[PDB]
Enzyme design. Sequence first.
Site, PDB file in Angstrom:
ATOM      1  N   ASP A  43       1.116  -1.199  -0.075  1.00 24.96           N
ATOM      2  CA  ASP A  43       0.016  -0.031  -0.115  1.00 24.96           C
ATOM      3  C   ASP A  43       0.902   1.067   0.094  1.00 24.96           C
ATOM      4  OD1 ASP A  43      -1.862   2.051   0.541  1.00 24.96           O
ATOM      5  OD2 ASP A  43      -3.295   0.328   0.981  1.00 24.96           O
ATOM      6  N   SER A  94      -7.316   4.298  -1.008  1.00 25.70           N
ATOM      7  CA  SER A  94      -6.980   2.837  -1.259  1.00 25.70           C
ATOM      8  C   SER A  94      -8.283   2.181  -1.601  1.00 25.70           C
ATOM      9  CB  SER A  94      -6.566   2.247   0.095  1.00 25.70           C
ATOM     10  OG  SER A  94      -5.534   2.777   0.560  1.00 25.70           O
ATOM     11  N   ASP A 145     -10.331  -2.792   6.313  1.00 23.66           N
ATOM     12  CA  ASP A 145      -9.527  -1.577   5.632  1.00 23.66           C
ATOM     13  C   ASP A 145      -9.805  -1.980   4.295  1.00 23.66           C
ATOM     14  OD1 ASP A 145      -8.017   0.819   5.619  1.00 23.66           O
ATOM     15  OD2 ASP A 145      -6.087   0.088   5.320  1.00 23.66           O
ATOM     16  N   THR A 147      -8.234  -2.141   1.127  1.00 17.17           N
ATOM     17  CA  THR A 147      -7.306  -3.069   0.441  1.00 17.17           C
ATOM     18  C   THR A 147      -7.915  -4.301   0.522  1.00 17.17           C
ATOM     19  OG1 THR A 147      -5.494  -1.545   0.638  1.00 17.17           O
ATOM     20  CG2 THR A 147      -5.083  -3.494  -0.638  1.00 17.17           C
ATOM     21  N   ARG A 158     -15.768   3.280   2.495  1.00 18.28           N
ATOM     22  CA  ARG A 158     -15.099   2.579   3.132  1.00 18.28           C
ATOM     23  C   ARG A 158     -15.089   2.813   4.786  1.00 18.28           C
ATOM     24  NH1 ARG A 158      -8.974   4.869   2.058  1.00 18.28           N
ATOM     25  NH2 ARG A 158      -8.423   3.288   3.596  1.00 18.28           N
ATOM     26  N   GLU A 314      -1.256  -8.045   1.206  1.00 16.54           N
ATOM     27  CA  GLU A 314      -1.049  -6.791   1.080  1.00 16.54           C
ATOM     28  C   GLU A 314      -0.164  -6.517   2.379  1.00 16.54           C
ATOM     29  OE1 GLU A 314      -4.042  -4.272   3.121  1.00 16.54           O
ATOM     30  OE2 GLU A 314      -3.250  -2.423   2.055  1.00 16.54           O
ATOM     31  N   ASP A 319       2.068   2.395   3.373  1.00 21.04           N
ATOM     32  CA  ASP A 319       1.580   3.636   3.388  1.00 21.04           C
ATOM     33  C   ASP A 319       1.280   4.150   4.796  1.00 21.04           C
ATOM     34  OD1 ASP A 319      -1.067   5.147   1.799  1.00 21.04           O
ATOM     35  OD2 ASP A 319      -2.206   4.502   3.680  1.00 21.04           O
ATOM     36  N   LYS A 320       0.740   3.394   5.847  1.00 21.68           N
ATOM     37  CA  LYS A 320       0.378   4.125   7.157  1.00 21.68           C
ATOM     38  C   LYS A 320       1.454   4.770   7.657  1.00 21.68           C
ATOM     39  CE  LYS A 320      -3.336   0.444   7.812  1.00 21.68           C
ATOM     40  NZ  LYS A 320      -4.447   0.964   7.204  1.00 21.68           N
ATOM     41  N   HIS A 323       2.280   8.054   5.745  1.00 22.12           N
ATOM     42  CA  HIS A 323       1.418   9.083   6.130  1.00 22.12           C
ATOM     43  C   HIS A 323       1.787   9.668   7.413  1.00 22.12           C
ATOM     44  CE1 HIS A 323      -2.505   8.632   3.611  1.00 22.12           C
ATOM     45  NE2 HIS A 323      -2.321   7.531   3.851  1.00 22.12           N
ATOM     46  N   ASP A 361      -1.060   0.253  -4.741  1.00 26.48           N
ATOM     47  CA  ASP A 361      -2.377   0.818  -4.991  1.00 26.48           C
ATOM     48  C   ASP A 361      -2.314   2.440  -5.650  1.00 26.48           C
ATOM     49  OD1 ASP A 361      -1.754   1.762  -2.307  1.00 26.48           O
ATOM     50  OD2 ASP A 361      -3.990   1.737  -1.826  1.00 26.48           O
ATOM     51  N   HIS A 362      -1.371   3.027  -5.095  1.00 22.23           N
ATOM     52  CA  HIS A 362      -1.029   4.559  -5.533  1.00 22.23           C
ATOM     53  C   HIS A 362       0.157   5.025  -4.987  1.00 22.23           C
ATOM     54  CE1 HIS A 362      -1.797   5.569  -1.295  1.00 22.23           C
ATOM     55  NE2 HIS A 362      -2.752   4.826  -1.227  1.00 22.23           N
ATOM     56  N   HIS A 404      -1.227  10.886  -0.252  1.00 19.09           N
ATOM     57  CA  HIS A 404      -0.867  10.225  -1.545  1.00 19.09           C
ATOM     58  C   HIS A 404      -0.384  11.131  -2.626  1.00 19.09           C
ATOM     59  CE1 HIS A 404      -4.106   7.096  -0.088  1.00 19.09           C
ATOM     60  NE2 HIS A 404      -3.341   7.229   0.799  1.00 19.09           N
TER      61      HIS A 404
HETATM   62 ZN   LIG Z   1      -4.235  -0.813   2.216  1.00 16.58          ZN
HETATM   63 ZN   LIG Z   2      -3.584   2.960  -0.167  1.00 18.58          ZN
HETATM   64 ZN   LIG Z   3      -2.911   5.988   2.478  1.00 20.80          ZN
END
Ligand SMILES: [Zn+2]
Ligand SMILES: [Zn+2]
Ligand SMILES: [Zn+2]
Lengths: 441, 441
Positions: A43, A94, A145, A147, A158, A314, A319-320, A323, A361-362, A404
Amino acid sequence: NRAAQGDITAPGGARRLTGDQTAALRDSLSDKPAKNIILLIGDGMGDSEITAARNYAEGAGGFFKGIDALPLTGQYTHYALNKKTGKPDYVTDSAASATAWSTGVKTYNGALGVDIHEKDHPTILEMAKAAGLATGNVSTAELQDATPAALVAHVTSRKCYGPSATSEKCPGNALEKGGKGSITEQLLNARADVTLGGGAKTFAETATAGEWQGKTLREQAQARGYQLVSDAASLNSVTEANQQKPLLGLFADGNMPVRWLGPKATYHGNIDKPAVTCTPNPQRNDSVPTLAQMTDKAIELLSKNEKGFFLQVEGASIDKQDHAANPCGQIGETVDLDEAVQRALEFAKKEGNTLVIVTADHAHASQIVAPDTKAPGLTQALNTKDGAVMVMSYGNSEEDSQEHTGSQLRIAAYGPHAANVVGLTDQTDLFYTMKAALGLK
Amino acid sequence: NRAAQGDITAPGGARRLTGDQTAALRDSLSDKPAKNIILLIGDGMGDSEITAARNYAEGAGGFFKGIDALPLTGQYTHYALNKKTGKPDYVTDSAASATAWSTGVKTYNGALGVDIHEKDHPTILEMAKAAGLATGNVSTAELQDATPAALVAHVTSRKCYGPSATSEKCPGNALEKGGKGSITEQLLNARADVTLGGGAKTFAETATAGEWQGKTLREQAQARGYQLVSDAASLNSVTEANQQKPLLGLFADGNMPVRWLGPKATYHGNIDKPAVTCTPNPQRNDSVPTLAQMTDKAIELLSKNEKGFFLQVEGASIDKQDHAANPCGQIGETVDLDEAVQRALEFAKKEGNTLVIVTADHAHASQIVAPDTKAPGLTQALNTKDGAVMVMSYGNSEEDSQEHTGSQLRIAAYGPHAANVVGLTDQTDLFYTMKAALGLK
Ligand SMILES: [Zn+2]
Ligand SMILES: [Zn+2]
Ligand SMILES: [Zn+2]
Ligand SMILES: [Zn+2]
Ligand SMILES: [Zn+2]
Ligand SMILES: [Zn+2]
């Protein structure tokens, strides 16, 4: 292998190739069907995040034995849609992205398994299962979550984790209003053979309607034939997983803990704080399975199905921690993923009919910049395996969460039909690549 | 063609693929010699930069008919080396990076055609010319600037434009001290068949020693058989370029003007300033050739040679406008490069023995972020071809210049030997790829 050949200061010593690739690559091409697919998602794992992790853990001229070893590579676009206008929204979340690869349709940020009109579309995991394939869904995230949810839940936001939030925020989806249910209820209906991750907390809610009303979703799961595991030894003791006894592993209350600890990047932190070295997270209990260990058991159980299997894995917390502007956490979760990827490639190489794909994902915030950088966001200096300083910068938000980014990013593959990730593609092509490779309808 | 199929809001409408790619990509795979190579570099052109430009000019689901059309893609590393330690320096400048693909050896930031020990190494252009091939070198930057200078000059610092600065910054290369000379002097000695760009300013200096001592570097060129042009019409009318009459075009004092005008990104500019639409640059006179037009003449003149040619083309000002946090500049220069790329591909498809390669020297600052982003750096909202807002962020420098980044980035290719860009490679592999493709020694 694609590590530097030798002495990076000398001519030819930083080369990653040893000879012409044309023959090898021709031989990487087969369009025979895939029996199995393993899709690994990091992620927020854009090229930048891969590069920073590689640099820190393996050295710049190093090589991720999993991540970097998939021979067919390209770039793909993961823009979402504006829900009102239908036009592109250049930075996805996501949910919209996971919806794209799992359904083959673009959608708006926050949406799972539904298009901009809020209409449901079936997922690759649902169409696997319908064709009599085994199904796996694995994540270090809370299983609600975006994903992992996208593969088994169709909802308009979501945030609709369980009954309570779904009633308030997805009235159209809520069970008592005649909808399919919360993400957790729909997950229970979908009944993949193997589902492993975090997110126990939401299982403590009781359903407000349906055949299992008044019972916690945990109870419902037990009532419905599911074997529940919650730590690495109980997971390892499972001997089968199928429609008569599907496996649901809940290894933490929310997200599973990160593998590495380090400090949070700070304003002028590469200038005002010494360089950092990451350390294994002293708070992550040895009895929590890792992502590669979750991946082992899932491959082991699913590979028993003679027809084939589909498996999504995943690395959720790259990602987290991106962030959170936490380089060590971010990098450690990338290392974590690379281990799970090695597992997948090792199974796939020996089995010979398994298509393995690795992407994100991005894209995200983290940038690798020069050590003397004076930047307006959050930075930090790291000592790498090479014995040099790398600086990481998180410069795209003044609020508490680095955001992101829109950049296209790497996708790589190995195995049957891997040709279809090469060149420029869209995230929604990946749905169709998967569909076709398994010959689904 | 890899545009979106259809209605990006509907199932399958954002797909870029129209079917299974395995057989097409098989047919893209040739290991026969390349007779010619065209190497196009977008300076600072990371995946983010490509994405932003596509989004803006062609829409998110659009397709750069040049840039996006090369079928064999991968990701390459371009870290430089610390001069003292020999360890990786994770964020290169243009000089170390161009030195890597041009000599096949890593080096320190600011070095040209030399290793960290200050030892010269031969370039792919010099090696082409020695094997009897025709050679061109084209750029929108001043021709002394790192990217073109690396093919023809060997200096210890990139700042050594002519005699004046060379005597005092590269005392060991200064002609009067027995060195090979300034970048401009060495450029003239190397005598590529075709050399086109800006950088006329430096040619006004006079040499301090050597055969053409006391004359301007311009007069030296004349005296050595070079045809000099200064605009598009004069360039158009050249009919041959070779070792007897080599061509040198000088179309501006310093850098050539950019194609598009728009305002500089500012702090909270996506919020406090309205969305921008780029317009054509009033400062770029029509008499200045474009990159495509430079590329046209170059291809035409160089293709006379029966044995083959090597050509490098640089869209140099993607980087410079990224430095200046100017999205219209940056994007305009990426569109400019996509045109030159089209020329090159059209030529390669027809001739059929030509390898074309498109990549960047390193990554950069610009990030595509959400419309309501509140970032600490410089931002701007733009109206794209899709009629939606894209925001761009420059968040890694509190000084007047936004900085490079170290992420690996896209490399793509078409024609004989293009397999060798697929997967993870290093920028130094590109040298060897080019060398083996042309059977050089
Ligand atoms: Zn995710
Ligand atoms: Zn994501
Ligand atoms: Zn994110
Ligand atoms: Zn550059
Ligand atoms: Zn340049
Ligand atoms: Zn630059």
